[PDB]
């Protein structure tokens, strides 16, 4: 068999049949926001019984924002440790220095790409 398993990261490819036969193959693709990394499977088959083979959406990962170098004379630490869309980045300035412009940046998802909600701040010399 029946409707193939549903997942969080990947979805089905093509019209969902009410009944699948033994032997036939069903394929998945990553959902909007996720991307695929080899070589874990993205498909599954109807076994000699009438259940589906094992299968996980581990092949699909959450989109990531670009790496951010510590501001000069500063320090850029992920506030959740992730670079995964949804989580943010915290900025701290060293001794004898002060930050200018947004000590926190969000990693938001815009379309199919994950980007930062701003330009990394500066650490100024006091």
């Amino acid at each position: 068999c029946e409707e193939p398993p549903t997942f969080e990261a990947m979805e089905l490819i093509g019209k969902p049949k009410p009944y699948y036969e033994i032997g036939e193959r069903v394929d998945y693709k990553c959902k909007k926001g996720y991307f695929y990394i080899p070589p874990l499977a993205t498909h599954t088959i109807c076994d000699r019984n009438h259940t589906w083979l094992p299968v996980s959406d581990d092949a699909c990962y959450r989109e990531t924002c670009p790496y951010i170098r510590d501001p000069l004379n500063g320090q850029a630490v992920p506030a959740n440790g992730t670079y995964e869309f949804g989580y943010q980045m915290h900025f701290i300035c060293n001794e004898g220095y002060y930050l200018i412009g947004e000590e926190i940046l969000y990693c938001e998802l815009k379309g199919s790409v994950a980007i930062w909600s701003g330009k990394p701040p500066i650490c100024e010399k006091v």
Partner: protein, 183 residues
Amino acid sequence: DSINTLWTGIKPPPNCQIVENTDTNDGKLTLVLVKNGGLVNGYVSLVGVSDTVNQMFTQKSATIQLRLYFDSSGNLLTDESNLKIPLKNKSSSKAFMPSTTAYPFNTTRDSENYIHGICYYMTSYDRSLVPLNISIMLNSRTISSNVAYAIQFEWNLNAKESPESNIATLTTSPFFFSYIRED
């Protein structure tokens, strides 16, 4: 010419899906890929078929993104792609795909993988021009175990005010490009 051109063909039928959720083809994508040395020459224009698509330019800004995926052979995976009709020669298609060493498949999207430029939309009433931001991502992002090559076209409207006030056939000026091809 010994198989030189891979294209959608001249003046094609509705052959792709532009609107997010639907199953009826609402776009006429003209794509022409030509082998030339170590490079491929590209020609790509778009035409709107559906009403919902031809209304997109009544907004101050819109965005259209068609992505094509290919197997290891170089054949359109029609299921995953926004392009719903396989490419054909003018007479493997691997020779036409974007080199994997040139524009890799990554696990984070090299700026080195995008092509960027500008094509234009002609208004309905006074033929005046409106810049559309075109951008072509080569490979870089795979969504299935089948995918071996990928080309993504993204048109972007963004203007002080909307180009159209009523619905009218969306058409993007031909945008030419080139990339280092597989072999």
